[PDB]
A and B are shown apart, each in its own frame.
Chain A
Amino acid sequence: XXXXXXXXXXXXXXXXXXXXXXXXXXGYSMFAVGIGALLFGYWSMMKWNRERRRLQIEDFEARIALMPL
């Protein structure tokens, strides 16, 4: 018997198929997070600015209180 190269089929590798698929973000869903992060962003930032006003008047008060300076 003579032995040569043998053939293999099984699944035939599956040639030409789109492996690319959309993931995580769809379109409308990411905009709700996007503007949602903005709405949370400005609201939390301005609370510290109002807290800065408590310091702002009190810091400049030191110059008014000190006249022997």
Chain B
Amino acid sequence: TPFFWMFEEREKMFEFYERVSGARMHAAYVRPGGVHQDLPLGLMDDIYEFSKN
């Protein structure tokens, strides 16, 4: 059970990675110049909604 209890949550978690950078898992998002790309407008509404549940 617990493997599939949290992997539905985990597949929803990779959507935050996909929306912030073009790759699913491993992304060159963190760089020596701080952060590569800005947070899009459809993330901060999603992070708060995800953390609440």
Contacts and interface: CB of A to CB of B under 8 A. Distances in A.
Interface residues of A, number: 9
A7 to B, nearest CB: 7
Q: Which of A3, A4, A15 has the most B CB atoms < 10 Å from its CB?
A: A4
A13 B38 contact: no
A13 B39 contact: no
A4 B51 contact: no
A8 interface: yes
A8 B52 contact: no
Interface of A: 3-8, 11, 13, 15
Interface of B: 38-41, 43-45, 48, 51-52
